[PDB]
mmCIF file of all heavy atoms in Angstrom:
data_model
loop_
_atom_site.group_PDB
_atom_site.id
_atom_site.type_symbol
_atom_site.label_atom_id
_atom_site.label_comp_id
_atom_site.label_asym_id
_atom_site.label_seq_id
_atom_site.Cartn_x
_atom_site.Cartn_y
_atom_site.Cartn_z
ATOM 1 N N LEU E 1 -18.649 -13.414 -12.680
ATOM 2 C CA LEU E 1 -17.814 -13.595 -11.486
ATOM 3 C C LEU E 1 -16.387 -13.172 -11.786
ATOM 4 O O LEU E 1 -15.765 -12.493 -10.961
ATOM 5 C CB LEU E 1 -17.852 -15.020 -10.953
ATOM 6 C CG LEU E 1 -17.023 -15.262 -9.709
ATOM 7 C CD1 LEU E 1 -17.461 -14.334 -8.541
ATOM 8 C CD2 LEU E 1 -17.067 -16.722 -9.281
ATOM 9 N N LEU E 2 -15.857 -13.575 -12.963
ATOM 10 C CA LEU E 2 -14.478 -13.184 -13.285
ATOM 11 C C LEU E 2 -14.322 -11.700 -13.362
ATOM 12 O O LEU E 2 -13.393 -11.081 -12.805
ATOM 13 C CB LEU E 2 -14.071 -13.842 -14.593
ATOM 14 C CG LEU E 2 -12.677 -13.464 -15.142
ATOM 15 C CD1 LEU E 2 -11.580 -14.000 -14.212
ATOM 16 C CD2 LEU E 2 -12.451 -14.020 -16.539
ATOM 17 N N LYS E 3 -15.242 -11.011 -14.091
ATOM 18 C CA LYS E 3 -15.173 -9.559 -14.221
ATOM 19 C C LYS E 3 -15.287 -8.855 -12.933
ATOM 20 O O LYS E 3 -14.565 -7.877 -12.632
ATOM 21 C CB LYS E 3 -16.250 -9.109 -15.226
ATOM 22 C CG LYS E 3 -16.140 -7.644 -15.602
ATOM 23 C CD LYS E 3 -17.154 -7.285 -16.733
ATOM 24 C CE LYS E 3 -17.067 -5.810 -17.096
ATOM 25 N NZ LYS E 3 -18.035 -5.460 -18.211
ATOM 26 N N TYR E 4 -16.180 -9.321 -12.073
ATOM 27 C CA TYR E 4 -16.297 -8.733 -10.736
ATOM 28 C C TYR E 4 -15.063 -8.973 -9.903
ATOM 29 O O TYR E 4 -14.590 -8.077 -9.235
ATOM 30 C CB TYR E 4 -17.516 -9.337 -10.002
ATOM 31 C CG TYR E 4 -17.612 -8.773 -8.619
ATOM 32 C CD1 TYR E 4 -17.912 -7.400 -8.370
ATOM 33 C CD2 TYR E 4 -17.433 -9.582 -7.498
ATOM 34 C CE1 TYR E 4 -18.013 -6.899 -7.115
ATOM 35 C CE2 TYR E 4 -17.514 -9.067 -6.208
ATOM 36 C CZ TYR E 4 -17.809 -7.717 -6.062
ATOM 37 O OH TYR E 4 -17.922 -7.203 -4.776
ATOM 38 N N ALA E 5 -14.451 -10.171 -9.985
ATOM 39 C CA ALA E 5 -13.233 -10.443 -9.241
ATOM 40 C C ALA E 5 -12.126 -9.479 -9.647
ATOM 41 O O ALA E 5 -11.412 -8.951 -8.768
ATOM 42 C CB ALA E 5 -12.808 -11.897 -9.379
ATOM 43 N N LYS E 6 -12.043 -9.139 -10.936
ATOM 44 C CA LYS E 6 -10.963 -8.276 -11.370
ATOM 45 C C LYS E 6 -11.257 -6.841 -10.952
ATOM 46 O O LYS E 6 -10.326 -6.156 -10.440
ATOM 47 C CB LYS E 6 -10.808 -8.312 -12.904
ATOM 48 C CG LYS E 6 -10.236 -9.611 -13.384
ATOM 49 C CD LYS E 6 -9.945 -9.566 -14.908
ATOM 50 C CE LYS E 6 -9.618 -10.951 -15.380
ATOM 51 N NZ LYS E 6 -9.396 -11.007 -16.880
ATOM 52 N N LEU E 7 -12.471 -6.373 -11.111
ATOM 53 C CA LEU E 7 -12.850 -5.025 -10.677
ATOM 54 C C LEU E 7 -12.594 -4.815 -9.158
ATOM 55 O O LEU E 7 -11.946 -3.853 -8.752
ATOM 56 C CB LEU E 7 -14.318 -4.754 -11.003
ATOM 57 C CG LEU E 7 -14.674 -4.402 -12.462
ATOM 58 C CD1 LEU E 7 -16.189 -4.226 -12.574
ATOM 59 C CD2 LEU E 7 -13.950 -3.152 -12.855
ATOM 60 N N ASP E 8 -13.092 -5.792 -8.402
ATOM 61 C CA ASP E 8 -12.950 -5.670 -6.922
ATOM 62 C C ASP E 8 -11.464 -5.727 -6.516
ATOM 63 O O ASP E 8 -11.030 -4.970 -5.656
ATOM 64 C CB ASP E 8 -13.717 -6.748 -6.187
ATOM 65 C CG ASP E 8 -13.775 -6.532 -4.701
ATOM 66 O OD1 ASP E 8 -14.490 -5.574 -4.272
ATOM 67 O OD2 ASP E 8 -13.064 -7.235 -3.961
ATOM 68 N N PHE E 9 -10.691 -6.552 -7.187
ATOM 69 C CA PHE E 9 -9.255 -6.638 -6.887
ATOM 70 C C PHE E 9 -8.627 -5.271 -7.089
ATOM 71 O O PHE E 9 -7.911 -4.754 -6.241
ATOM 72 C CB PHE E 9 -8.561 -7.713 -7.706
ATOM 73 C CG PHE E 9 -7.129 -7.964 -7.255
ATOM 74 C CD1 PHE E 9 -6.839 -8.992 -6.389
ATOM 75 C CD2 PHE E 9 -6.109 -7.077 -7.579
ATOM 76 C CE1 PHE E 9 -5.526 -9.212 -5.911
ATOM 77 C CE2 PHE E 9 -4.803 -7.306 -7.146
ATOM 78 C CZ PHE E 9 -4.530 -8.345 -6.271
ATOM 79 N N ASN E 10 -8.944 -4.596 -8.216
ATOM 80 C CA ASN E 10 -8.343 -3.331 -8.551
ATOM 81 C C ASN E 10 -8.760 -2.243 -7.562
ATOM 82 O O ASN E 10 -7.943 -1.382 -7.185
ATOM 83 C CB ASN E 10 -8.669 -2.927 -9.972
ATOM 84 C CG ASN E 10 -7.859 -3.707 -11.018
ATOM 85 O OD1 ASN E 10 -6.930 -4.422 -10.638
ATOM 86 N ND2 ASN E 10 -8.154 -3.482 -12.278
ATOM 87 N N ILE E 11 -10.036 -2.254 -7.137
ATOM 88 C CA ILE E 11 -10.506 -1.279 -6.190
ATOM 89 C C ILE E 11 -9.799 -1.421 -4.831
ATOM 90 O O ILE E 11 -9.285 -0.436 -4.214
ATOM 91 C CB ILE E 11 -12.034 -1.374 -6.029
ATOM 92 C CG1 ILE E 11 -12.716 -1.017 -7.353
ATOM 93 C CG2 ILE E 11 -12.537 -0.509 -4.901
ATOM 94 C CD1 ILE E 11 -14.203 -1.333 -7.407
ATOM 95 N N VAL E 12 -9.765 -2.631 -4.322
ATOM 96 C CA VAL E 12 -9.035 -2.921 -3.071
ATOM 97 C C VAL E 12 -7.609 -2.479 -3.165
ATOM 98 O O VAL E 12 -7.019 -1.881 -2.299
ATOM 99 C CB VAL E 12 -9.210 -4.387 -2.650
ATOM 100 C CG1 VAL E 12 -8.446 -4.701 -1.370
ATOM 101 C CG2 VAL E 12 -10.700 -4.754 -2.529
ATOM 102 N N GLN E 13 -6.978 -2.807 -4.345
ATOM 103 C CA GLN E 13 -5.587 -2.462 -4.565
ATOM 104 C C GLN E 13 -5.394 -0.907 -4.423
ATOM 105 O O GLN E 13 -4.352 -0.502 -3.916
ATOM 106 C CB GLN E 13 -5.129 -2.943 -5.905
ATOM 107 C CG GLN E 13 -3.616 -3.116 -6.065
ATOM 108 C CD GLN E 13 -3.197 -3.231 -7.489
ATOM 109 O OE1 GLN E 13 -3.682 -2.489 -8.373
ATOM 110 N NE2 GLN E 13 -2.374 -4.286 -7.778
ATOM 111 N N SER E 14 -6.317 -0.118 -4.967
ATOM 112 C CA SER E 14 -6.127 1.313 -4.846
ATOM 113 C C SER E 14 -6.078 1.705 -3.369
ATOM 114 O O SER E 14 -5.296 2.597 -2.964
ATOM 115 C CB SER E 14 -7.237 2.035 -5.588
ATOM 116 O OG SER E 14 -8.488 1.910 -4.895
ATOM 117 N N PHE E 15 -6.962 1.116 -2.554
ATOM 118 C CA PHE E 15 -6.853 1.366 -1.087
ATOM 119 C C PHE E 15 -5.465 1.037 -0.543
ATOM 120 O O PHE E 15 -4.840 1.753 0.241
ATOM 121 C CB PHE E 15 -7.914 0.567 -0.313
ATOM 122 C CG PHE E 15 -9.282 1.161 -0.358
ATOM 123 C CD1 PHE E 15 -10.225 0.755 -1.282
ATOM 124 C CD2 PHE E 15 -9.624 2.138 0.601
ATOM 125 C CE1 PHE E 15 -11.484 1.315 -1.274
ATOM 126 C CE2 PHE E 15 -10.901 2.687 0.574
ATOM 127 C CZ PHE E 15 -11.848 2.272 -0.339
ATOM 128 N N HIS E 16 -4.944 -0.170 -0.937
ATOM 129 C CA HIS E 16 -3.624 -0.557 -0.428
ATOM 130 C C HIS E 16 -2.572 0.390 -0.844
ATOM 131 O O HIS E 16 -1.582 0.690 -0.101
ATOM 132 C CB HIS E 16 -3.318 -1.958 -0.967
ATOM 133 C CG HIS E 16 -4.240 -3.030 -0.409
ATOM 134 N ND1 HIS E 16 -4.404 -4.282 -1.028
ATOM 135 C CD2 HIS E 16 -5.056 -3.060 0.675
ATOM 136 C CE1 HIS E 16 -5.246 -5.020 -0.345
ATOM 137 N NE2 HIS E 16 -5.666 -4.297 0.691
ATOM 138 N N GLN E 17 -2.606 0.908 -2.100
ATOM 139 C CA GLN E 17 -1.561 1.869 -2.551
ATOM 140 C C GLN E 17 -1.589 3.131 -1.755
ATOM 141 O O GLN E 17 -0.547 3.685 -1.444
ATOM 142 C CB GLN E 17 -1.786 2.093 -4.069
ATOM 143 C CG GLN E 17 -1.418 0.904 -4.905
ATOM 144 C CD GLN E 17 -1.843 1.078 -6.402
ATOM 145 O OE1 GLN E 17 -2.516 2.023 -6.790
ATOM 146 N NE2 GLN E 17 -1.482 0.058 -7.205
ATOM 147 N N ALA E 18 -2.807 3.622 -1.402
ATOM 148 C CA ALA E 18 -2.805 4.841 -0.554
ATOM 149 C C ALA E 18 -2.234 4.530 0.852
ATOM 150 O O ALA E 18 -1.582 5.440 1.448
ATOM 151 C CB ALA E 18 -4.288 5.336 -0.441
ATOM 152 N N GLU E 19 -2.472 3.346 1.354
ATOM 153 C CA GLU E 19 -1.895 2.947 2.655
ATOM 154 C C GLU E 19 -0.388 2.898 2.579
ATOM 155 O O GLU E 19 0.341 3.356 3.521
ATOM 156 C CB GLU E 19 -2.445 1.598 3.111
ATOM 157 C CG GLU E 19 -3.935 1.614 3.358
ATOM 158 C CD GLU E 19 -4.519 0.196 3.398
ATOM 159 O OE1 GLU E 19 -3.715 -0.774 3.357
ATOM 160 O OE2 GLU E 19 -5.762 0.090 3.478
ATOM 161 N N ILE E 20 0.138 2.305 1.495
ATOM 162 C CA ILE E 20 1.612 2.241 1.311
ATOM 163 C C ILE E 20 2.217 3.641 1.236
ATOM 164 O O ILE E 20 3.257 3.896 1.809
ATOM 165 C CB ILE E 20 1.956 1.436 0.059
ATOM 166 C CG1 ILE E 20 1.465 -0.031 0.200
ATOM 167 C CG2 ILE E 20 3.490 1.461 -0.213
ATOM 168 C CD1 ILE E 20 1.632 -0.785 -1.080
ATOM 169 N N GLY E 21 1.588 4.553 0.504
ATOM 170 C CA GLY E 21 2.121 5.917 0.449
ATOM 171 C C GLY E 21 2.180 6.528 1.845
ATOM 172 O O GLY E 21 3.222 7.123 2.222
ATOM 173 N N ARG E 22 1.132 6.411 2.638
ATOM 174 C CA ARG E 22 1.159 6.934 4.021
ATOM 175 C C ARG E 22 2.298 6.250 4.868
ATOM 176 O O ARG E 22 3.019 6.941 5.596
ATOM 177 C CB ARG E 22 -0.170 6.771 4.681
ATOM 178 C CG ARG E 22 -1.168 7.828 4.261
ATOM 179 C CD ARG E 22 -2.446 7.745 5.103
ATOM 180 N NE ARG E 22 -3.161 6.490 4.913
ATOM 181 C CZ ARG E 22 -4.053 6.276 3.898
ATOM 182 N NH1 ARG E 22 -4.282 7.224 3.003
ATOM 183 N NH2 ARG E 22 -4.657 5.120 3.820
ATOM 184 N N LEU E 23 2.423 4.934 4.704
ATOM 185 C CA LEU E 23 3.380 4.194 5.557
ATOM 186 C C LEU E 23 4.827 4.560 5.157
ATOM 187 O O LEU E 23 5.708 4.670 5.998
ATOM 188 C CB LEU E 23 3.131 2.709 5.463
ATOM 189 C CG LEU E 23 1.904 2.224 6.199
ATOM 190 C CD1 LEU E 23 1.471 0.806 5.764
ATOM 191 C CD2 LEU E 23 2.089 2.280 7.714
ATOM 192 N N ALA E 24 5.064 4.722 3.834
ATOM 193 C CA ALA E 24 6.386 5.071 3.361
ATOM 194 C C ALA E 24 6.710 6.484 3.832
ATOM 195 O O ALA E 24 7.888 6.751 4.228
ATOM 196 C CB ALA E 24 6.396 5.027 1.826
ATOM 197 N N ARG E 25 5.771 7.389 3.848
ATOM 198 C CA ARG E 25 6.111 8.737 4.357
ATOM 199 C C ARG E 25 6.401 8.734 5.848
ATOM 200 O O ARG E 25 7.346 9.362 6.286
ATOM 201 C CB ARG E 25 4.989 9.770 3.961
ATOM 202 C CG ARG E 25 4.981 10.002 2.467
ATOM 203 C CD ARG E 25 3.984 11.046 1.979
ATOM 204 N NE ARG E 25 2.591 10.727 2.294
ATOM 205 C CZ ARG E 25 1.739 10.018 1.536
ATOM 206 N NH1 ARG E 25 2.143 9.548 0.364
ATOM 207 N NH2 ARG E 25 0.495 9.840 1.923
ATOM 208 N N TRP E 26 5.583 7.968 6.617
ATOM 209 C CA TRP E 26 5.930 7.746 8.022
ATOM 210 C C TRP E 26 7.325 7.200 8.210
ATOM 211 O O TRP E 26 8.135 7.749 8.996
ATOM 212 C CB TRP E 26 4.890 6.813 8.618
ATOM 213 C CG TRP E 26 5.244 6.254 9.988
ATOM 214 C CD1 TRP E 26 5.252 6.969 11.163
ATOM 215 C CD2 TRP E 26 5.713 4.972 10.346
ATOM 216 N NE1 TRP E 26 5.666 6.201 12.208
ATOM 217 C CE2 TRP E 26 5.954 4.944 11.711
ATOM 218 C CE3 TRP E 26 5.979 3.814 9.539
ATOM 219 C CZ2 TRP E 26 6.455 3.777 12.342
ATOM 220 C CZ3 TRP E 26 6.412 2.656 10.208
ATOM 221 C CH2 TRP E 26 6.643 2.683 11.596
ATOM 222 N N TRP E 27 7.667 6.136 7.502
ATOM 223 C CA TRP E 27 8.952 5.466 7.656
ATOM 224 C C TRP E 27 10.124 6.364 7.334
ATOM 225 O O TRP E 27 11.105 6.462 8.118
ATOM 226 C CB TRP E 27 8.988 4.221 6.776
ATOM 227 C CG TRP E 27 10.073 3.263 7.013
ATOM 228 C CD1 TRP E 27 11.029 2.852 6.132
ATOM 229 C CD2 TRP E 27 10.338 2.529 8.213
ATOM 230 N NE1 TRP E 27 11.842 1.935 6.670
ATOM 231 C CE2 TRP E 27 11.457 1.696 7.975
ATOM 232 C CE3 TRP E 27 9.729 2.455 9.466
ATOM 233 C CZ2 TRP E 27 11.979 0.829 8.941
ATOM 234 C CZ3 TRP E 27 10.251 1.613 10.425
ATOM 235 C CH2 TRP E 27 11.374 0.796 10.171
ATOM 236 N N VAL E 28 10.047 7.073 6.215
ATOM 237 C CA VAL E 28 11.053 8.050 5.883
ATOM 238 C C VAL E 28 11.140 9.142 6.956
ATOM 239 O O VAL E 28 12.262 9.571 7.355
ATOM 240 C CB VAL E 28 10.874 8.618 4.491
ATOM 241 C CG1 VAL E 28 11.804 9.776 4.239
ATOM 242 C CG2 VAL E 28 11.047 7.525 3.384
ATOM 243 N N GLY E 29 10.016 9.525 7.488
ATOM 244 C CA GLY E 29 10.038 10.513 8.591
ATOM 245 C C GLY E 29 10.682 10.019 9.851
ATOM 246 O O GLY E 29 11.188 10.802 10.653
ATOM 247 N N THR E 30 10.715 8.684 10.064
ATOM 248 C CA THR E 30 11.401 8.158 11.236
ATOM 249 C C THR E 30 12.898 8.180 11.004
ATOM 250 O O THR E 30 13.652 8.076 11.999
ATOM 251 C CB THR E 30 10.984 6.708 11.566
ATOM 252 O OG1 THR E 30 11.518 5.818 10.606
ATOM 253 C CG2 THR E 30 9.444 6.582 11.663
ATOM 254 N N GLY E 31 13.394 8.214 9.755
ATOM 255 C CA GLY E 31 14.760 8.068 9.453
ATOM 256 C C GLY E 31 15.252 6.599 9.531
ATOM 257 O O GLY E 31 16.400 6.371 9.174
ATOM 258 N N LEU E 32 14.440 5.659 9.948
ATOM 259 C CA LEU E 32 14.979 4.267 10.052
ATOM 260 C C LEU E 32 15.238 3.627 8.711
ATOM 261 O O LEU E 32 15.797 2.550 8.643
ATOM 262 C CB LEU E 32 14.024 3.362 10.841
ATOM 263 C CG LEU E 32 13.568 3.845 12.227
ATOM 264 C CD1 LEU E 32 12.756 2.741 12.897
ATOM 265 C CD2 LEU E 32 14.668 4.276 13.134
ATOM 266 N N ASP E 33 14.805 4.266 7.596
ATOM 267 C CA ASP E 33 15.174 3.759 6.271
ATOM 268 C C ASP E 33 16.632 3.954 5.959
ATOM 269 O O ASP E 33 17.202 3.236 5.120
ATOM 270 C CB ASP E 33 14.306 4.443 5.179
ATOM 271 C CG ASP E 33 14.448 5.974 5.197
ATOM 272 O OD1 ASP E 33 14.444 6.564 6.266
ATOM 273 O OD2 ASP E 33 14.570 6.532 4.119
ATOM 274 N N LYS E 34 17.315 4.905 6.624
ATOM 275 C CA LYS E 34 18.722 5.175 6.426
ATOM 276 C C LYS E 34 19.628 4.414 7.409
ATOM 277 O O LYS E 34 20.839 4.592 7.372
ATOM 278 C CB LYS E 34 19.016 6.674 6.515
ATOM 279 C CG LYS E 34 18.167 7.501 5.566
ATOM 280 C CD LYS E 34 18.292 6.952 4.126
ATOM 281 C CE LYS E 34 17.521 7.773 3.139
ATOM 282 N NZ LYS E 34 18.067 9.166 2.940
ATOM 283 N N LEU E 35 19.045 3.663 8.337
ATOM 284 C CA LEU E 35 19.902 2.938 9.289
ATOM 285 C C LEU E 35 20.175 1.547 8.761
ATOM 286 O O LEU E 35 19.426 1.012 7.941
ATOM 287 C CB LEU E 35 19.194 2.887 10.684
ATOM 288 C CG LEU E 35 18.968 4.239 11.326
ATOM 289 C CD1 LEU E 35 18.342 4.032 12.713
ATOM 290 C CD2 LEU E 35 20.222 5.044 11.403
ATOM 291 N N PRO E 36 21.255 0.867 9.226
ATOM 292 C CA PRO E 36 21.679 -0.408 8.650
ATOM 293 C C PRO E 36 20.949 -1.644 9.228
ATOM 294 O O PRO E 36 21.559 -2.696 9.534
ATOM 295 C CB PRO E 36 23.180 -0.470 8.963
ATOM 296 C CG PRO E 36 23.311 0.360 10.173
ATOM 297 C CD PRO E 36 22.312 1.423 10.095
ATOM 298 N N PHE E 37 19.633 -1.525 9.371
ATOM 299 C CA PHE E 37 18.829 -2.628 9.889
ATOM 300 C C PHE E 37 17.615 -2.830 8.975
ATOM 301 O O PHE E 37 17.058 -1.875 8.416
ATOM 302 C CB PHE E 37 18.317 -2.328 11.323
ATOM 303 C CG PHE E 37 19.386 -1.750 12.231
ATOM 304 C CD1 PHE E 37 19.261 -0.420 12.632
ATOM 305 C CD2 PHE E 37 20.436 -2.524 12.648
ATOM 306 C CE1 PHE E 37 20.293 0.120 13.464
ATOM 307 C CE2 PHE E 37 21.440 -1.979 13.469
ATOM 308 C CZ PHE E 37 21.355 -0.652 13.846
#
């Protein structure tokens, strides 16, 4: 169970990292990262 929990955590995390990359590119494309909010 421990080994599976670690493997599954890492696999799900890779999905999350791809989502963050897409969201960061969207956000920078909005320009709202350079505004003071």
Side-chain angles (χ1 to χ4, degrees):
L1 180 59
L2 176 66
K3 188 173 179 178
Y4 178 66
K6 291 188 190 175
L7 282 178
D8 190 72
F9 189 97
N10 284 352
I11 294 169
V12 179
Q13 203 194 45
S14 71
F15 280 95
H16 295 161
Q17 289 169 355
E19 297 164 6
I20 297 173
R22 281 188 297 275
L23 286 165
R25 291 184 299 270
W26 168 74
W27 192 239
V28 171
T30 73
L32 307 187
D33 57 318
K34 305 307 181 69
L35 299 183
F37 318 109

